[PDB]
Every structure is written in structure tokens, then in C-alpha cells.
Amino acid sequence: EVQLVESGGGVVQPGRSLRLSCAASGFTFSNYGMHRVRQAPGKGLEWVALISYEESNRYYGDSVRGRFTISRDNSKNTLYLQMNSLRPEDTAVYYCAKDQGPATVMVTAIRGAMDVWGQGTTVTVSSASTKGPSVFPLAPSSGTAALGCLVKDYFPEPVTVSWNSGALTSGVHTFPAVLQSSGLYSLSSVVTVPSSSLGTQTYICNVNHKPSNTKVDKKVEPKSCDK
Amino acid sequence: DIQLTQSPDSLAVSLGERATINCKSSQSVLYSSNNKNYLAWYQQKPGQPPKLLIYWASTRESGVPDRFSGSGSGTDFTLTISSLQAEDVAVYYCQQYFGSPSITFGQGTRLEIKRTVAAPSVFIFPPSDEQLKSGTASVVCLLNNFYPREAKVQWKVDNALQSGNSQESVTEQDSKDSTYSLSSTLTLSKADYEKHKVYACEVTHQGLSSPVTKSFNRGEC
Amino acid sequence: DIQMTQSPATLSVSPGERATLSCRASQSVSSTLAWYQQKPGQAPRLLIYGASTRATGIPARFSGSGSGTEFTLTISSLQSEDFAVYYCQQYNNWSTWTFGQGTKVDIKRTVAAPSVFIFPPSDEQLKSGTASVVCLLNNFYPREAKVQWKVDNALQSGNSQESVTEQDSKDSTYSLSSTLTLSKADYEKHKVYACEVTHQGLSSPVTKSFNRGE
Amino acid sequence: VQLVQSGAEVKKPGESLRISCKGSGHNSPSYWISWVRQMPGKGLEWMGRIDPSDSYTNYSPSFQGHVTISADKSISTAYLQWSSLQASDTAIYYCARHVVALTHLYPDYWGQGTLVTVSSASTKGPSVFPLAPSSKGTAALGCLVKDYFPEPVTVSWNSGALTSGVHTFPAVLQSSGLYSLSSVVTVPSSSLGTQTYICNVNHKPSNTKVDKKVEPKSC
Amino acid sequence: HHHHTNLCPFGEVFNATRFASVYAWNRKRISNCVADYSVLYNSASFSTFKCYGVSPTKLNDLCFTNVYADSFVIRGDEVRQIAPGQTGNIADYNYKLPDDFTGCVIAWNSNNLDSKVGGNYNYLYRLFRKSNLKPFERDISTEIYQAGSTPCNGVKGFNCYFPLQSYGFQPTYGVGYQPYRVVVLSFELLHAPATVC
Ligand SMILES: *[C@@H]1O[C@H](CO[C@@H]2O[C@@H](C)[C@@H](O)[C@@H](O)[C@@H]2O)[C@@H](O[C@@H]2O[C@H](CO)[C@@H](O[C@@H]3O[C@H](CO)[C@@H](O)[C@H](O)[C@@H]3O)[C@H](O)[C@H]2NC(C)=O)[C@H](O)[C@H]1NC(C)=O
């Protein structure tokens, strides 16, 4: 079966280099042209690089023309993307794709399309240091009430949030993170519950951020404004 | 370069109904020799890589359900879904590979499910007492389960409309009632937060007859 | 090429028990493997082909299995006509067809230590110009055994040949002989002639020796 | 399905030789007959294979520059040929077939084999030397059937009166191209002075029958 | 013993130890014998058996003036190109069927026969070609395909590519890339009144 396993992504300082890999199986690799396509966070698809089946044709997008170098090892069936002098605009998920034809730009009659894609490597260019998040409660206000947890100031992506260790799933919304001006990410995870259970059911969110070896459980309680 | 322009940027179609996505190219994409337009269509669901649907403008990729169909030629192209199924909610890209300026994609069309207008449930959350001990105040405004996606949130601090200190995040369309949820985070310093008393967010949405505003008073609880 | 290796070297199974034979390939061979049977003095006979399919006309007690690199031949309820040597041959279509070394299937019996005797070359053979030193290992089990010639405590190699009888039809034992061949001039240069026998039935290597002219 | 090889051969080293193997009942003109070598006590080793119709060989790397395999589809016969024989080529040679069955391959008939003996010797009868019993409960004596050609020899003890415990080993081919054989027998040590032990060697090709008395050596 | 009562040697076509590459496909002419197509269709090992212009059931009841048996190898996803009115690298550049094709197409997965660990590169296919093949045309040319206006002078390189290319069949590949043996039967009907055939 067709299979493209990518690797090499990660956090890189601006101006530093990073080599992306892409191992292929299930088809005669030395015979097909390979593409590299990235997708910046929240943006559309953008073409990056291209190599021919005999590692001859090499073409690049305007934004990466000299900084990126594409190569292939037809003996190890692997595609490489050597990304040098990285900039923030390069932060994206990078896919490698197989061409239907040998990616021979001049033949034209044999021009192919993106047949099979890989799962994509995450690449983040930033001068941020790895940090675990702080979890702050979004306390329910004094028929149904809303509560949640605030996951603020962590790096890099991603985090995983559950409620009552998975016992609470109905009405759970965990928002995609937002990148703050400081360079760290911020995220919120909420859930709607009946107002009659705010005094009887203990609600605890379970945030897990593997890059910092951090797992936090935070008890969200109603702001007791009565004494 | 060959510029690809899809129409529309987003559309909603109810299940079992027909969806149609157009895509126009700058220069013609037609090798007159074989008479094949070199245009491809892709489906991209959240978190996944793209999935090839159509190539040669009108040829279907092996395994794609027969409800997907591409047509058009030259500079005007069309991707049509006939019996829109729940799993077809995704972004669709046209992509030319005429071989001239390498390869260019389209901006991508967002395909959501159409339903009855639904009003948002609004809740506001004051900054917790644990965060203010750190020096930063984060005020959160929630728009839970609404349709359609278009919504306008307006923060007000002592009746002064706030902008430039707020970030929003929207969930993808829910898988069972096909609604949206939105989160806007108003960030302030502890000193600036302690200078004003009335904090509120003003939501405007189609499902609402007049702008809704939820509020709390600074240090009132 | 694709090296085929089997295990064990030899085995011992009583009638009715289940023989288990393995076969390993150096690289994958998909499933184009074949097991054979070669009874003494007879041409080989096919048992399994395609790793698992039984050849028509073969008892259903034999069965093959495996895929890729490791395979197995199972003889459920071993019979008395099942004593032979079993190989595994692969036949991938555009490739050199390779062969295993084989495995010998015997009667199960208790371990027995060999009887070691050393025979000096007769005076009638020394008059001819050649000396043949024979070392005997009489009725032992299992088949595996190691003989090491020692001439004045110099381990000899390259000047000896060995011959083994078939498993005896009454006690299931083997008999092995090793003939150390030397010239009469080379034979009269040394004094001590010995052969060292190591075996499973022997706790330590047993050595029988004679001195030239004694 | 039926393959028929040629009869056993005997050649001097350096002489040319070609054995044959005719087939019948094949699925189609495009089969896969293959040659396999088997030395006296060695194992199986593949050599080559041809599709008669196409006559396309696939010699094994350890055999490529040594033997040539040819075929003539008119007689549906396969051939294996040596340009120059050496003593190492002395072995048994089988031909096996491998018909095609659309989905996969299938080996059917297996040749009975042709024995090849490369030796520069001739017909010679064996010398019989005694393996005397050692002066040191049971003792072992025997005979040495050395330097004879060709096979086989038959060894008996006391004209057939001593069959218990006799192990007549299969012969070995020395470097000299002649065969050597040993036959032993274990007897009670108390009978070494009261029971005479004689071994009857019979070698029909050379018209030789030797009886040799084996006594405890006199020191 | 050969007679015309003897049946046609379809075994030689289907039961060959090795097929030709699709760019240089083989063509056997079956003639001067009696053909029985009952054995062919009945076989449960044919993953593809599509006939055009004639139903397979009425094959033995038909009168042909001529029969062709073309045989080659392609990969699984390329089987659908062996039909009238198709395009692709195989139908345009390797083997093309006429629009009024009157015959049958028989295919079976041959992954136990034409794939080796490390890749069987014996099978080739023409990938580069200026204009499409005509129906039943065989191009065994090996001339370096010139893409640009700069001549190649027989040398491989940029804008100068070898027109042929190997499948490299490995047994671990997906069925869409595994080797499939194909047999294409071309019929030649007899112009005769209905009262005959
Ligand atoms: C290509 O060759 C295969 C292989 O034939 C094999 O080799 C021969 C030398 C003989 O030894 C065959 O016995 C052997 O299988 C042909 O496959 C065989 O086809 C025949 C009919 O053509 C099948 O016979 C039938 O078997 C079924 C049960 O499977 C019975 O119900 C029928 O009554 C009939 O006996 C036979 O099964 C089949 N062999 C296998 C292993 O499947 C194949 O037909 C041939 N193809 C062509 C186009 O010539």
C-alpha cells in the first residue's frame, strides 16, 4: 500500500536549519516525482518544492527559492527537504506528496497531480522556550450554567484537555489555541451543565502538555459569594 | 503565475442536497494536443492531509464516491457533490498543474452543513483570583452552539469599546447538531484591570433580534 | 542470494509424537517455499509447496506454515516410514533458487555415551608406506559428536575422514569411524597418537591413546 | 508427467560429459526444468534451470562458470554438460520440473538421478589389513578394506556366523580416487584367545575375495 | 501427435513462465485448431474478464476467421486502461485497443510470479512518447526522448529522458501496484448470414 512517513519537524530558532524527511513504501519510488507542500496555521495550501524521478528537475516556490533545497535518495526511497535560514512565515505543517507522473516539468503532456500525501510534519520557527501552561478556572456565574478551564502561556503545541478523566464528554468544547504576542499559546476548554448540579458534581479538567512533561488537574468550583 | 480563484469562499448545503464549487484560472489550462484540462480537486478535513478527488478536470480518483463530479474546461471549472453526506464537511481546493509556474492551489472553499438559524448562549468569565496574583487579567466571553458562523463580539470596559486586546478562536462545526462555538479572550494588565468597574461583551448574531450583552462588575463577587 | 537455514540439526521423535521442523530465510520470500522428503537412497519427494499447501498423494499428517522469513513443517503422529531428511527450497521466480541444509528425523531414545577405541596401523600397512589410524565410536546417541585427533598434543586437521552408519534398526544408535591417514615417514616421527571424543553422554572429553611401537 | 535421465557415468578428470533428462506431460511448452547436485553425504544444491521453448538459463552463482545447460524442445529433453571434469564433480545429479499454474508455480516430477564418478583410477581389488584388539569387559577388532575401485564391496565375519554387533561403515573416497572401507565388531574380551575372527571381503568387479584373520597383536 | 481436431493451445498463452513487458507486448496467433472458451470463463482465478462486442457465453457458438492472443504485464491500477476508449500512460503509449474492439480482456493478479523481494525490474513500460499509439501498435523504440529544443545526442539528463521505465515489483506493494498478467483475445468474425452462425 502507498505510505509516506514524514519526520524531522520541530521547533527551530529563527535563522537555523532543519532537514525534513519522508520515507516511501508500497510503490517504486525511484520512478515518481515528489512534492513538498506546507500549510501555515489557519491558512491554505501552498506549494513549496519539487524533484523529478531521476533527481534532475528541481523547482521551488518564490518564497523559498534559494533557502530550500530538495533532494532524494532513490536507494533508501526517501525524500528530503533541507530548510535553511528559517523565518516565522515558514511556520507550517509540511506534507510530502507523490506525483501521478515523473514530475518532469518540461514534458507537459505527462504533468501529474498530487496522488498520495503524507500525514505531515509540524515545523515551528520561534525564539520561544519550552514552558508548561498555567490552568485557571472559569468559574460559573452566581436553567443551565457554563464553566471551563483556561490554558494560557505554553509552548509549543499541543495540549490535551479532558473532563473528569473522560467521564464528562457531552457538551464539551475545547477551542484551538491562539498565539499571543508574547510568543506563547493560549487555549480554553468549556462545558455546559445543568444549574442544579453545580453543588453536587465535582468538575475537574485534565490538561496534558507532553513537551514540558506537565499534567495538571484543576478543580473548578462556583465562586462562593456567600458568607 | 497562474492564479486560481474559487467561488465561493464558503457555502452551506443541507444533507442529501447538491453542492457546487467553482474555480477559475487566470491563463487557460488546456493542452490542446490531448484535450485535457490539467486541473485537480482535493478534499481536506480538519487535521488530515488533502485527499485527491478529481484530476484532468473531470476524471475521478479511484475510491472516491460517485457523488463527487468535476466538469468545466479552459478557465472555468466546477466540483459538484450530488447527495451531500455528513462526512463531506471539509475544505475543497482546486489545483492547476499545467506545468507553467510550478503549481498553484486555490484559496479553498469551506463546505458546512446548512440548518435553521440558531442563537448563541452567551456567558462571561471574570479573571480567576489565582491569575490576578500573577499580574495578568484574562476576561473570557463564550458563544456556545450557534449558527451560522458569522458573529460579531464587542468588548466594553466602562462603556468604552475595546479592540486590539482580544483574540478569538472558533470550533469546527459540531458532528451531531452542526453548530459553532466561539471564544474571545480580552487580555489586560492587573493594573489596568483594577482601573475600571464594568466589563462586558456585546454579541450580535442573526438568531438574535437585538445585540445581547452579558456583564460583571469589577470585584463585585 | 537468500540463505536458507533450518533447525535443529537432527532430532528424535517416537511414533505418534509430533515432529516440529523450522526453516528460516535470509530475506523475505513471500510464500513460495517448499518442503521435501529424501529417504535414504531415494530421490527427494515433495510434501508442502506454497508454505502451506499439501501435495496431492501425501498423508494429511504433514502440514506446513509460515510466511516471509520463518516457516514450519509439522508431522503430526509420526510414523515408521517418516524417517528421512527434510529440506526447504524457495522458488521466487526471477531469483536463484536456494536450498536449506536439512534436518534428520529419527527414533527417540535415551542418551548413550560412545565406546572409544583407537587402532594403531598394522605392521603390514607400514611396510607399504602409509599409516591409517582409525578411531571408533560405537553405538552412541545422539548423532552429534566431535572427534579431535592429537599427535604429540598437536591437534590434527585436514588428514582425517569420517564415516557414520545409519541409525541401528534395534537400539537406534550410531557408529562413527575416523581414519587418520599419514605417511610412514610422518608416522615414525611422533610417539603419542590419540583421538578425543566429546559427546552428550560423556561428562568430559574421553581420549583413547596408544604410543608408537608399544 | 514423467522425466527420464541418463545412466550412471564414469569419466577421467578433464574429460567432457553431458547427461540427459527427457520430460513429458508438461502443462505447456514453457516449464522450468532444473538440475540439482547431491554429493555422497552432502545436501541438496540448486544449479540451473531452463524454459525449453525460450532456452533461457539462470545459472546459480556458485555454478555459473562451470557447467552449461542446454535443451532441445523437439525431443523435450534437458541437458547438463561439463567442459572439463574434476574429482569434486563426483555426485548424484537430479533433474526436477516446475510447471506454471497461472497464480503460482508448482513442482511436479523429480528425476531418479544420474550418478557421476570422476576418477582417474581403474578396476582394483582391496587390500585387507587387521584392526587388532587392544591388550587392555568387551574388546573391539575389525578389518580395513582400503584402496579398491569401483563400488561395492561386501564384508562378512566367520562366513556369516558373526552378525551380532557388526558395523560395516559406508566407504569413503580418498584423494587417490580409490575407495576405503572399515568394518568392525565388538566381542567379549575373554574370547580373544579362544575364538578366531576372520573377515570375508568380496569385490566382484576385480574378481577378488579375501579372508583375513584378525588376532590380538603379539608384542 | 498433431491434428486439427486437437484443441487450440491456450495453455501456451496463459501458462507461460514469463510474460513480455507491455511496451513490447507479445502477440500469438491461434489458428488451424478448435478453440473451447468454456474452460477460460469457468476459471475462478480471473479477477478481470470483460468482453467487448461479443458476449462470452456465445463464444463457442460463434465463427471467427482469425484469433489473436496478446499477452503482457502491468500493475493493478493500470488494468482499467486495457479497454476501448481509455487513455493514460498504458493506453496512449504502450497498448491501445480500437474503439470498435471485438474481443475479450482477461487479467489475473500475478504477485506470486512477477514480484521479487528487492524488486523485480524485468518488466518495463514506455512512459515518454510524442504522439499516442494507434490501435494494435507496438513501439519497442529506445531512443532518448528529447523534451527541450536542445538535442540529447543519445545522452540522458535534463530534458533528455529514457522513454522506458521499470515496475520494480515487490510482493509488499499494494494491489494497485502488484503485477497483473493480461491476455487480450482479438476476434475476426465471419461475414455470414444469420442462418449459419
Ligand atoms: C494452466 O495450468 C494449470 C495447472 O495445471 C496443473 O498442471 C498439469 C500438468 C496437471 O498436473 C494439472 O492437474 C495441474 O492442476 C491448469 O489448472 C488446472 O486446470 C484444470 C482444468 O483445466 C482443473 O481441473 C478441474 O479441477 C476441478 C477442481 O479444481 C474439477 O472440479 C474439474 O472437474 C476439473 O478436474 C484443475 O483443477 C486446475 N489445477 C489447479 C491446481 O487449479 C489450468 O487450467 C491451465 N490453464 C490453461 C489456460 O491452460
mmCIF file of N, CA, C and O in Angstrom, chain E residues 37-99:
data_model
loop_
_atom_site.group_PDB
_atom_site.id
_atom_site.type_symbol
_atom_site.label_atom_id
_atom_site.label_comp_id
_atom_site.label_asym_id
_atom_site.label_seq_id
_atom_site.Cartn_x
_atom_site.Cartn_y
_atom_site.Cartn_z
ATOM 1 N N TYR E 37 -13.639 -21.994 -25.336
ATOM 2 C CA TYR E 37 -13.575 -20.917 -24.359
ATOM 3 C C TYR E 37 -14.325 -21.243 -23.078
ATOM 4 O O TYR E 37 -14.370 -20.402 -22.174
ATOM 5 N N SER E 38 -14.913 -22.436 -22.983
ATOM 6 C CA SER E 38 -15.628 -22.809 -21.770
ATOM 7 C C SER E 38 -14.679 -22.912 -20.586
ATOM 8 O O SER E 38 -15.021 -22.506 -19.470
ATOM 9 N N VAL E 39 -13.477 -23.446 -20.810
ATOM 10 C CA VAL E 39 -12.520 -23.586 -19.720
ATOM 11 C C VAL E 39 -12.057 -22.221 -19.227
ATOM 12 O O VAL E 39 -11.782 -22.045 -18.033
ATOM 13 N N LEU E 40 -11.989 -21.231 -20.117
ATOM 14 C CA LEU E 40 -11.440 -19.932 -19.742
ATOM 15 C C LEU E 40 -12.365 -19.194 -18.781
ATOM 16 O O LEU E 40 -11.966 -18.846 -17.664
ATOM 17 N N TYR E 41 -13.611 -18.948 -19.198
ATOM 18 C CA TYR E 41 -14.535 -18.192 -18.356
ATOM 19 C C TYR E 41 -14.820 -18.920 -17.047
ATOM 20 O O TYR E 41 -14.962 -18.285 -15.995
ATOM 21 N N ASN E 42 -14.908 -20.253 -17.093
ATOM 22 C CA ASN E 42 -15.261 -21.020 -15.901
ATOM 23 C C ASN E 42 -14.222 -20.868 -14.798
ATOM 24 O O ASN E 42 -14.549 -21.016 -13.614
ATOM 25 N N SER E 43 -12.975 -20.570 -15.164
ATOM 26 C CA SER E 43 -11.908 -20.437 -14.181
ATOM 27 C C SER E 43 -12.236 -19.341 -13.176
ATOM 28 O O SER E 43 -12.608 -18.226 -13.551
ATOM 29 N N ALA E 44 -12.099 -19.664 -11.894
ATOM 30 C CA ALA E 44 -12.426 -18.741 -10.819
ATOM 31 C C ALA E 44 -11.235 -17.904 -10.382
ATOM 32 O O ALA E 44 -11.280 -17.292 -9.310
ATOM 33 N N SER E 45 -10.171 -17.869 -11.177
ATOM 34 C CA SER E 45 -8.962 -17.148 -10.817
ATOM 35 C C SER E 45 -8.739 -15.913 -11.680
ATOM 36 O O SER E 45 -7.657 -15.322 -11.625
ATOM 37 N N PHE E 46 -9.733 -15.500 -12.466
ATOM 38 C CA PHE E 46 -9.617 -14.328 -13.329
ATOM 39 C C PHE E 46 -10.306 -13.147 -12.654
ATOM 40 O O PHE E 46 -11.539 -13.086 -12.603
ATOM 41 N N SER E 47 -9.507 -12.208 -12.141
ATOM 42 C CA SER E 47 -10.066 -11.044 -11.463
ATOM 43 C C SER E 47 -10.685 -10.048 -12.433
ATOM 44 O O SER E 47 -11.478 -9.200 -12.010
ATOM 45 N N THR E 48 -10.337 -10.126 -13.714
ATOM 46 C CA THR E 48 -10.909 -9.263 -14.736
ATOM 47 C C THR E 48 -11.140 -10.088 -15.993
ATOM 48 O O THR E 48 -10.232 -10.789 -16.452
ATOM 49 N N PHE E 49 -12.359 -10.003 -16.542
ATOM 50 C CA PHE E 49 -12.771 -10.774 -17.719
ATOM 51 C C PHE E 49 -13.926 -10.012 -18.366
ATOM 52 O O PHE E 49 -15.110 -10.331 -18.199
ATOM 53 N N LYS E 50 -13.575 -8.977 -19.116
ATOM 54 C CA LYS E 50 -14.533 -8.124 -19.805
ATOM 55 C C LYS E 50 -14.397 -8.346 -21.302
ATOM 56 O O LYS E 50 -13.282 -8.356 -21.832
ATOM 57 N N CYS E 51 -15.532 -8.545 -21.970
ATOM 58 C CA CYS E 51 -15.587 -8.769 -23.406
ATOM 59 C C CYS E 51 -16.367 -7.642 -24.069
ATOM 60 O O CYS E 51 -17.357 -7.149 -23.518
ATOM 61 N N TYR E 52 -15.927 -7.251 -25.262
ATOM 62 C CA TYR E 52 -16.481 -6.103 -25.966
ATOM 63 C C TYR E 52 -16.952 -6.527 -27.348
ATOM 64 O O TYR E 52 -16.201 -7.156 -28.099
ATOM 65 N N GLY E 53 -18.194 -6.181 -27.681
ATOM 66 C CA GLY E 53 -18.763 -6.551 -28.957
ATOM 67 C C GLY E 53 -19.198 -7.993 -29.082
ATOM 68 O O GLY E 53 -19.680 -8.382 -30.149
ATOM 69 N N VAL E 54 -19.055 -8.801 -28.033
ATOM 70 C CA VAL E 54 -19.448 -10.205 -28.084
ATOM 71 C C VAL E 54 -19.574 -10.745 -26.664
ATOM 72 O O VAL E 54 -18.675 -10.559 -25.836
ATOM 73 N N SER E 55 -20.689 -11.408 -26.369
ATOM 74 C CA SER E 55 -20.897 -11.949 -25.030
ATOM 75 C C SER E 55 -20.087 -13.227 -24.845
ATOM 76 O O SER E 55 -20.088 -14.087 -25.732
ATOM 77 N N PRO E 56 -19.403 -13.393 -23.710
ATOM 78 C CA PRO E 56 -18.571 -14.593 -23.522
ATOM 79 C C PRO E 56 -19.356 -15.889 -23.572
ATOM 80 O O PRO E 56 -18.776 -16.943 -23.863
ATOM 81 N N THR E 57 -20.661 -15.842 -23.296
ATOM 82 C CA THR E 57 -21.459 -17.063 -23.288
ATOM 83 C C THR E 57 -21.601 -17.641 -24.690
ATOM 84 O O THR E 57 -21.597 -18.865 -24.867
ATOM 85 N N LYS E 58 -21.718 -16.782 -25.699
ATOM 86 C CA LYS E 58 -21.861 -17.218 -27.085
ATOM 87 C C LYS E 58 -20.524 -17.232 -27.814
ATOM 88 O O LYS E 58 -20.454 -16.907 -29.003
ATOM 89 N N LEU E 59 -19.441 -17.604 -27.126
ATOM 90 C CA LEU E 59 -18.135 -17.667 -27.775
ATOM 91 C C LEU E 59 -17.970 -18.957 -28.571
ATOM 92 O O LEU E 59 -17.572 -18.926 -29.741
ATOM 93 N N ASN E 60 -18.269 -20.103 -27.953
ATOM 94 C CA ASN E 60 -18.148 -21.378 -28.650
ATOM 95 C C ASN E 60 -19.168 -21.526 -29.770
ATOM 96 O O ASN E 60 -18.986 -22.375 -30.649
ATOM 97 N N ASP E 61 -20.231 -20.726 -29.760
ATOM 98 C CA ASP E 61 -21.261 -20.772 -30.787
ATOM 99 C C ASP E 61 -21.017 -19.772 -31.910
ATOM 100 O O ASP E 61 -21.918 -19.539 -32.722
ATOM 101 N N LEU E 62 -19.829 -19.177 -31.977
ATOM 102 C CA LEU E 62 -19.526 -18.168 -32.977
ATOM 103 C C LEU E 62 -18.442 -18.659 -33.928
ATOM 104 O O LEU E 62 -17.658 -19.560 -33.609
ATOM 105 N N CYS E 63 -18.412 -18.042 -35.110
ATOM 106 C CA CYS E 63 -17.496 -18.398 -36.188
ATOM 107 C C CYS E 63 -16.522 -17.245 -36.403
ATOM 108 O O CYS E 63 -16.923 -16.166 -36.853
ATOM 109 N N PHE E 64 -15.247 -17.472 -36.092
ATOM 110 C CA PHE E 64 -14.197 -16.481 -36.285
ATOM 111 C C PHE E 64 -13.300 -16.894 -37.444
ATOM 112 O O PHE E 64 -12.964 -18.074 -37.588
ATOM 113 N N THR E 65 -12.914 -15.919 -38.267
ATOM 114 C CA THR E 65 -11.955 -16.153 -39.339
ATOM 115 C C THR E 65 -10.511 -15.995 -38.877
ATOM 116 O O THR E 65 -9.596 -16.325 -39.640
ATOM 117 N N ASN E 66 -10.292 -15.534 -37.641
ATOM 118 C CA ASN E 66 -8.955 -15.251 -37.128
ATOM 119 C C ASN E 66 -8.985 -14.916 -35.631
ATOM 120 O O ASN E 66 -9.951 -14.335 -35.138
ATOM 121 N N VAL E 67 -7.930 -15.276 -34.898
ATOM 122 C CA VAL E 67 -7.891 -15.081 -33.450
ATOM 123 C C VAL E 67 -6.487 -14.645 -33.047
ATOM 124 O O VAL E 67 -5.494 -15.246 -33.473
ATOM 125 N N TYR E 68 -6.403 -13.603 -32.227
ATOM 126 C CA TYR E 68 -5.131 -13.105 -31.722
ATOM 127 C C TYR E 68 -5.112 -13.190 -30.204
ATOM 128 O O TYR E 68 -6.127 -12.946 -29.549
ATOM 129 N N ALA E 69 -3.955 -13.540 -29.650
ATOM 130 C CA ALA E 69 -3.764 -13.641 -28.205
ATOM 131 C C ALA E 69 -2.576 -12.764 -27.820
ATOM 132 O O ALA E 69 -1.420 -13.174 -27.963
ATOM 133 N N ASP E 70 -2.862 -11.557 -27.340
ATOM 134 C CA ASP E 70 -1.829 -10.642 -26.880
ATOM 135 C C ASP E 70 -1.647 -10.784 -25.375
ATOM 136 O O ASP E 70 -2.623 -10.869 -24.627
ATOM 137 N N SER E 71 -0.391 -10.801 -24.934
ATOM 138 C CA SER E 71 -0.078 -11.029 -23.530
ATOM 139 C C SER E 71 1.042 -10.102 -23.081
ATOM 140 O O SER E 71 2.009 -9.883 -23.815
ATOM 141 N N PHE E 72 0.910 -9.573 -21.869
ATOM 142 C CA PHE E 72 1.874 -8.640 -21.285
ATOM 143 C C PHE E 72 1.600 -8.549 -19.786
ATOM 144 O O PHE E 72 0.786 -9.304 -19.241
ATOM 145 N N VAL E 73 2.271 -7.612 -19.118
ATOM 146 C CA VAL E 73 2.115 -7.391 -17.684
ATOM 147 C C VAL E 73 2.016 -5.891 -17.420
ATOM 148 O O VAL E 73 2.747 -5.096 -18.022
ATOM 149 N N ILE E 74 1.098 -5.506 -16.532
ATOM 150 C CA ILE E 74 1.002 -4.156 -15.991
ATOM 151 C C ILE E 74 0.693 -4.267 -14.504
ATOM 152 O O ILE E 74 0.638 -5.366 -13.942
ATOM 153 N N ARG E 75 0.481 -3.125 -13.862
ATOM 154 C CA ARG E 75 0.140 -3.112 -12.449
ATOM 155 C C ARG E 75 -1.374 -3.005 -12.274
ATOM 156 O O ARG E 75 -2.114 -2.712 -13.215
ATOM 157 N N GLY E 76 -1.826 -3.254 -11.040
ATOM 158 C CA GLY E 76 -3.251 -3.421 -10.788
ATOM 159 C C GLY E 76 -4.090 -2.223 -11.190
ATOM 160 O O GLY E 76 -5.151 -2.377 -11.796
ATOM 161 N N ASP E 77 -3.637 -1.013 -10.847
ATOM 162 C CA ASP E 77 -4.404 0.179 -11.193
ATOM 163 C C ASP E 77 -4.437 0.431 -12.694
ATOM 164 O O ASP E 77 -5.310 1.165 -13.167
ATOM 165 N N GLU E 78 -3.520 -0.163 -13.449
ATOM 166 C CA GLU E 78 -3.447 0.046 -14.887
ATOM 167 C C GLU E 78 -4.300 -0.937 -15.679
ATOM 168 O O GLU E 78 -4.353 -0.833 -16.908
ATOM 169 N N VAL E 79 -4.970 -1.879 -15.009
ATOM 170 C CA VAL E 79 -5.786 -2.860 -15.720
ATOM 171 C C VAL E 79 -6.956 -2.177 -16.415
ATOM 172 O O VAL E 79 -7.333 -2.544 -17.535
ATOM 173 N N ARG E 80 -7.539 -1.162 -15.773
ATOM 174 C CA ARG E 80 -8.692 -0.475 -16.340
ATOM 175 C C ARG E 80 -8.361 0.282 -17.620
ATOM 176 O O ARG E 80 -9.285 0.743 -18.300
ATOM 177 N N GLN E 81 -7.079 0.416 -17.968
ATOM 178 C CA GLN E 81 -6.689 1.060 -19.215
ATOM 179 C C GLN E 81 -6.723 0.117 -20.412
ATOM 180 O O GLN E 81 -6.609 0.584 -21.550
ATOM 181 N N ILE E 82 -6.868 -1.189 -20.190
ATOM 182 C CA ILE E 82 -6.915 -2.148 -21.288
ATOM 183 C C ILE E 82 -8.367 -2.334 -21.711
ATOM 184 O O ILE E 82 -8.958 -3.401 -21.510
ATOM 185 N N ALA E 83 -8.949 -1.289 -22.294
ATOM 186 C CA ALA E 83 -10.329 -1.317 -22.755
ATOM 187 C C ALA E 83 -10.491 -0.252 -23.824
ATOM 188 O O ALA E 83 -9.767 0.749 -23.805
ATOM 189 N N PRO E 84 -11.412 -0.436 -24.768
ATOM 190 C CA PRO E 84 -11.630 0.597 -25.787
ATOM 191 C C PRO E 84 -12.034 1.921 -25.156
ATOM 192 O O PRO E 84 -12.766 1.962 -24.165
ATOM 193 N N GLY E 85 -11.530 3.007 -25.734
ATOM 194 C CA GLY E 85 -11.896 4.334 -25.283
ATOM 195 C C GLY E 85 -11.245 4.785 -23.997
ATOM 196 O O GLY E 85 -11.835 5.585 -23.264
ATOM 197 N N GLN E 86 -10.046 4.300 -23.696
ATOM 198 C CA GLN E 86 -9.319 4.695 -22.499
ATOM 199 C C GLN E 86 -8.098 5.526 -22.866
ATOM 200 O O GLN E 86 -7.626 5.513 -24.006
ATOM 201 N N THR E 87 -7.592 6.262 -21.876
ATOM 202 C CA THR E 87 -6.300 6.926 -22.004
ATOM 203 C C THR E 87 -5.433 6.603 -20.793
ATOM 204 O O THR E 87 -5.755 5.706 -20.008
ATOM 205 N N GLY E 88 -4.338 7.327 -20.635
ATOM 206 C CA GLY E 88 -3.336 7.007 -19.641
ATOM 207 C C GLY E 88 -2.040 6.547 -20.285
ATOM 208 O O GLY E 88 -1.953 6.304 -21.489
ATOM 209 N N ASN E 89 -1.016 6.425 -19.437
ATOM 210 C CA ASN E 89 0.313 6.081 -19.930
ATOM 211 C C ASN E 89 0.322 4.742 -20.654
ATOM 212 O O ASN E 89 1.094 4.555 -21.600
ATOM 213 N N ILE E 90 -0.527 3.803 -20.238
ATOM 214 C CA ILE E 90 -0.538 2.493 -20.881
ATOM 215 C C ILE E 90 -1.342 2.518 -22.174
ATOM 216 O O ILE E 90 -0.908 1.975 -23.196
ATOM 217 N N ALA E 91 -2.526 3.132 -22.152
ATOM 218 C CA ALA E 91 -3.385 3.103 -23.330
ATOM 219 C C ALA E 91 -2.871 4.022 -24.428
ATOM 220 O O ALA E 91 -3.057 3.737 -25.615
ATOM 221 N N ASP E 92 -2.228 5.123 -24.057
ATOM 222 C CA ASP E 92 -1.701 6.063 -25.036
ATOM 223 C C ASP E 92 -0.323 5.675 -25.554
ATOM 224 O O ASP E 92 -0.026 5.916 -26.731
ATOM 225 N N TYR E 93 0.528 5.084 -24.709
ATOM 226 C CA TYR E 93 1.935 4.908 -25.040
ATOM 227 C C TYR E 93 2.401 3.459 -25.101
ATOM 228 O O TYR E 93 3.512 3.217 -25.583
ATOM 229 N N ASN E 94 1.613 2.496 -24.629
ATOM 230 C CA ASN E 94 2.075 1.113 -24.566
ATOM 231 C C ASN E 94 1.181 0.146 -25.323
ATOM 232 O O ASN E 94 1.684 -0.660 -26.114
ATOM 233 N N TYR E 95 -0.133 0.192 -25.105
ATOM 234 C CA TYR E 95 -1.049 -0.737 -25.761
ATOM 235 C C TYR E 95 -2.410 -0.075 -25.895
ATOM 236 O O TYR E 95 -3.036 0.262 -24.886
ATOM 237 N N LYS E 96 -2.871 0.094 -27.131
ATOM 238 C CA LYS E 96 -4.132 0.761 -27.416
ATOM 239 C C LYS E 96 -5.057 -0.178 -28.174
ATOM 240 O O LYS E 96 -4.653 -0.779 -29.174
ATOM 241 N N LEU E 97 -6.286 -0.295 -27.697
ATOM 242 C CA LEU E 97 -7.390 -1.055 -28.265
ATOM 243 C C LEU E 97 -8.255 -0.154 -29.143
ATOM 244 O O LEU E 97 -8.435 1.027 -28.830
ATOM 245 N N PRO E 98 -8.800 -0.673 -30.239
ATOM 246 C CA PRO E 98 -9.646 0.157 -31.102
ATOM 247 C C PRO E 98 -10.991 0.446 -30.454
ATOM 248 O O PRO E 98 -11.432 -0.239 -29.529
ATOM 249 N N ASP E 99 -11.648 1.490 -30.963
ATOM 250 C CA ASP E 99 -12.960 1.853 -30.439
ATOM 251 C C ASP E 99 -14.011 0.804 -30.779
ATOM 252 O O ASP E 99 -14.935 0.577 -29.989
#
